[PDB]
Amino acid sequence: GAVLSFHNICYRVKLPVEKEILSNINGIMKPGLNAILGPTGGGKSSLLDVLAARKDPSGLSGDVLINGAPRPANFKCNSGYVVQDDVVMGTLTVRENLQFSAALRLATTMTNHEKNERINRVIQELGLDKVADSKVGTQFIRGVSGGERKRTSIGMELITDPSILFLDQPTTGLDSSTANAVLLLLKRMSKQGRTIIFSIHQPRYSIFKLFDSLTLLASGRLMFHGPAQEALGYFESAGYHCEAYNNPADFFLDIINGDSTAVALNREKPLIEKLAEIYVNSSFYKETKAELHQLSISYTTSFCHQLRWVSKRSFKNLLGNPQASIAQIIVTVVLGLVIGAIYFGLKNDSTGIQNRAGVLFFLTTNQCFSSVSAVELFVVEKKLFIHEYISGYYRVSSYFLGKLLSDLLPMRMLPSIIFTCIVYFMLGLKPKADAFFVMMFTLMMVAYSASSMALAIAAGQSVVSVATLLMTICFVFMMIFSGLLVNLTTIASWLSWLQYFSIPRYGFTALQHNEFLGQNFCPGLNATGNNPCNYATCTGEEYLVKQGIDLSPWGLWKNHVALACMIVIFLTIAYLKLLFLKKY
Amino acid sequence: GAVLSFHNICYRVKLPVEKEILSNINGIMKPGLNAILGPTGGGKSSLLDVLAARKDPSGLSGDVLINGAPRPANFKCNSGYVVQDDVVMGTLTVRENLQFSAALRLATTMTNHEKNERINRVIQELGLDKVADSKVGTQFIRGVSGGERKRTSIGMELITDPSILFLDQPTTGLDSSTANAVLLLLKRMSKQGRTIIFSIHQPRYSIFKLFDSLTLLASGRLMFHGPAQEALGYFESAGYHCEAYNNPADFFLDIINGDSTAVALNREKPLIEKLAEIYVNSSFYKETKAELHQLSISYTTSFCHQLRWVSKRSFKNLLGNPQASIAQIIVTVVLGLVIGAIYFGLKNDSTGIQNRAGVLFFLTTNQCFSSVSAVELFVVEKKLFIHEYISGYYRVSSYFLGKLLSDLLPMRMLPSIIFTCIVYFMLGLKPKADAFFVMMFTLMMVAYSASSMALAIAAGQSVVSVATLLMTICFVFMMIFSGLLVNLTTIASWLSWLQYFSIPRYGFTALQHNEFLGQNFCPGLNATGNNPCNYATCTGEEYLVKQGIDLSPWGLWKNHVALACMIVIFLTIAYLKLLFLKKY
Ligand SMILES: Nc1ncnc2c1ncn2[C@@H]1O[C@H](COP(=O)(O)OP(=O)(O)OP(=O)(O)O)[C@@H](O)[C@H]1O
Ligand SMILES: Nc1ncnc2c1ncn2[C@@H]1O[C@H](COP(=O)(O)OP(=O)(O)OP(=O)(O)O)[C@@H](O)[C@H]1O
Ligand SMILES: [Mg+2]
Ligand SMILES: [Mg+2]
């Protein structure tokens, strides 16, 4: 079994002004069933996160050791922490959240049939049969109840059968009889060699009798640590006799909570510093410190497996709630028909180039400005990314590349195929076969490059309010330098370098070079040359010399390798902002 | 006291496929302390929402009566429902959330000093002294603990001292001794004449002894309803003897949960239809039905008070987290300096109108496209709007107009003053005094009209993913008809009506009419007229005849009364989408 031991643990929280949650706390947690009792605000979820390595070590001032050695990297893939406030995806099912947790935290030596046999066993043992095929709720659509959602959270860190298993108040939300059935499940599990550390509120006498070790927190300090059967005979030595309470756990927390103003105002030298001084001078502390001095990433499943379940769950959220994907395709068809109907029948005239170079401007600023909806890709599920990463489901790179494929394909590839097709059979553009697909490829690359900049601003961010704001104002900053309203050659030399950052400048140049190769606009002419008066712009090559575009075939694909470099750079910034995010 | 009585209550949930949560349930809840026990998934939070009038009545099939009369409108302003999952604003403080609840749910006959004396009393009686000046946490920044946040939720519906008081598991998250101090607070409160209906998990014997009425739910059906002191002698008549359990509440839920597969697999004609058949044939049901047949908005505080606290709390969220407001002003100054530096020194030349009519296009598409950040105004706090409206804090109209003022002033008025000032002393526009403020007023009206359309799409919506998407694609739909790239007169008659919907068409016309009054561009001329060749566009009035703009002073302010009509219409749609939202 695993012997988790923690020695001189302190903690601090900067509110600047530091506050000392968790003063000097020492303890050993052998393989068994290790309970942590104490009042509200005593430091139980803060101790249980230090022991599970989920607090920022800038404020932590001790060391936690498993079997006398420090933690491996290798620890979130071998332990389980059930959180208190039930972080579970509410667009999936109780069975589907258990199928997702078993698919990424059990090895693939187990087949998919043997994993679902262990998922069916956990649903039976936790009492989740009537709601196994029911949706866990969100905060707007009611679903599975609060105690049934609690046991879903217990079960996801229980199919994975880790050796060290942390639970943050697992019976909070359960009644008197399911809570006994949960701790008899854990007591059966702890006799296999697992160490189970949990905090608990209000255990009954059938639950308190199951404990192997007892830990009493109060206002950050340790009131008692040792065996649970020897705790009642400890407080009788300190002057507190039991029999006014048939439950010892109801007696232990009336001692260490007597100084509370809620208890002093209702039916009724400090008490904490008195009871903490008794414990340090006791024999249970001398037994612990004499053994503490004697004692003193390689994920479970591969990259390609985690890629095929992060994306698989992400397509099920889009096939289950297709509001943003259906409304994407509707207003792309409607906008594609309007742009096709205004510039219907493009002619070769003195005003046939301003129509063609004006229709290609709204094709690029569609694909740029429509990519502001990619800001919400990593923000809406930030809390579940932070939870499932520190629980060890996936690499960041498999969450990153698996969540791209559910924003790349349904939202940026497919509305650039449909939008290119609609404005091709009703505008009368360059009628060749290859220039259709160069146009289709160009509108995808400005949709990917502007979506990658939506991800680079918004990765690892809690609200979309700042990132949507910098997304649209950087676009109108790039829409100046696109080369339509203001001439790029007439811009002074100290501002003409900002045209290389514009996503619309590379897309609109690549659509001008694709279309205005040798289309002729002056024929229909009279004897002497044309006789309108700018003078004229006869061929399409003379329009590109005026704009400053290379007539070579490199002048087309210079614009696509510069958009491909803005995808690699902006998706590396977006990756590293998820990687170096503080998950604590 | 208030005698809440509920008669033939049924409920259904459409998952389509209907499921019958809450079969036939009958009961009377006299003034006292009315507990609801039962297993997880038994229907306790569903019954407690039917009784508090918070379920959709399309699935509800009974009637709830207070004192033999139905509910008034007047009920959320006279009752209190403490929810289970702790809906509390985590950018405020434990004291500030209690100060906000007392300011809107107590009358203004009480002064602000007497309200804070009752807030200090509730903080003492609930044990919130050490965290009264500490921030309630969000889900990303840890703050106040889970039991300390629970008692903040208890205390906000307890300063308001309602006569009927519902609590959804108030001791879930509390230990053995604070939970006794909470129900001794409620027992002291119930002896003043208040009826207190609550569901509870795991009450100890000190808590169970306080009950005045007991209700036992199991799988939607009623196992027992009556006095709590007469419940133990009820199950002894049905064949269940007590003394293997020193706690009666631990004995009551081992009977009605024995058929659970969690209990059958751990240490161990249906049981529910057996125990429900005993209760209907019993005498406690005959006493209830013989009395059920015998028995069978005007907000607390005014509009102007609720307006001055919804906005007051909303400015404190912007002064506490000014990320989107500082980053608004930074990229407005930076964009205002770039637009001023590209078109620096506007001359009166053959190309001096394309510079002036091209700089006014990016001034309007700044103010339009920057208003996509107003999509998140009503979405980020949708859950707290739905909670605080059914709890009776405010009208919708005071939440609507109070949340506008924290998006109108810091985000749309102030970055339109700064942005007009910057591009005025470095472009060299119309140098008069009134044309500066007509320009400033025009950029505010396109910022308000495009923000009002951001609210009309996004009011009452859970994610911003659809509403940001329709916001930016409707803008590029309106940017076609603005009258810059494509001539509005050359558009065919069946598409030339879409120019009246464009916010950028009214702003860019009002900036062209403001600036191109009689500015002259042709002087500097030679003997015969000008000698470049389009021919020329000499005065600014000839440019407006070509664009199709009235030269009258009505031709300016036609554009501002049409933007003011798009504020009134889009903020009426945005109001009614919050009003007719389904809050159940
Ligand atoms: N990051 C933090 N910021 C502010 N306060 C904190 C932080 N961490 C802990 N605290 C404070 O420390 C105390 C202990 O917190 P903790 O959540 O560990 O208590 P707990 O025993 O888990 O409470 P409960 O059992 O009610 O959940 C709380 O009162 C909390 O206000
Ligand atoms: N709107 C709904 N959609 C789906 N299922 C529902 C809905 N309302 C209730 N249920 C189901 O009905 C059962 C009763 O729900 P309820 O929340 O009332 O139980 P509860 O006794 O409050 O549970 P707990 O005490 O654990 O919170 C639950 O199992 C839940 O799955
Ligand atoms: Mg805890
Ligand atoms: Mg309940």
From Swiss-Prot, chains A, B:
It catalyses: ATP + H2O + xenobioticSide 1 = ADP + phosphate + xenobioticSide 2; urate(in) + ATP + H2O = urate(out) + ADP + phosphate + H(+); indoxyl sulfate(in) + ATP + H2O = indoxyl sulfate(out) + ADP + phosphate + H(+); sphing-4-enine 1-phosphate(in) + ATP + H2O = sphing-4-enine 1-phosphate(out) + ADP + phosphate + H(+). Residues 1-325, 380-407, 458-465, 582-584 are cytoplasmic. Changing H513A: Strongly reduced binding to hemin but not to PPIX. Homodimer; disulfide-linked. The minimal functional unit is a homodimer, but the major oligomeric form in plasma membrane is a homotetramer with possibility of higher order oligomerization up to homododecamers. Glycans are attached at N526. Coiled coil: none annotated. Belongs to the ABC transporter superfamily. ABCG family. Eye pigment precursor importer (TC 3.A.1.204) subfamily. Changing T365A: No effect on stability. Increased estrone-3 sulfate ATPase-coupled transmembrane transporter activity. Increased substrate-induced ATP hydrolysis. Increased substrate transport. Residues 347-358, 429-436, 487-560 are extracellular. This is Broad substrate specificity ATP-binding cassette transporter ABCG2. GO terms for cellular component: apical plasma membrane; brush border membrane; external side of apical plasma membrane; membrane raft; mitochondrial membrane; nucleoplasm; plasma membrane. One of its GO terms (biological process) is cellular detoxification. Specifically inhibited by the fungal toxin fumitremorgin C and Ko143. Changing M479A: No effect on stability. No effect on estrone-3 sulfate ATPase-coupled transmembrane transporter activity. No effect on substrate-induced ATP hydrolysis. No effect on substrate transport. Residues 4-244 form the ABC transporter domain. ATP binds at residues 38-45, 142-148, 169, 201. Pfam families: ABC2_membrane (PF01061), ABC2_membrane_7 (PF19055), ABC_tran (PF00005). Changing V476F: No effect on stability. Decreased estrone-3 sulfate ATPase-coupled transmembrane transporter activity. Increased basal and substrate-induced ATP hydrolysis. Decreased substrate transport. Changing T365F: No effect on stability. Decreased estrone-3 sulfate ATPase-coupled transmembrane transporter activity. Decreased substrate-induced ATP hydrolysis. Decreased substrate transport. Changing L485A: Loss of protein expression. Keywords: ATP-binding, Cell membrane, Disulfide bond, Glycoprotein, Lipid transport, Membrane, Mitochondrion, Nucleotide-binding, Phosphoprotein, Translocase, Transmembrane, Transmembrane helix, Transport. SUPFAM superfamilies: P-loop containing nucleoside triphosphate hydrolases (SSF52540). The gene is ABCG2. Highly expressed in placenta. Low expression in small intestine, liver and colon. Expressed in brain (at protein level). Disulfide bonds join C522-C538.
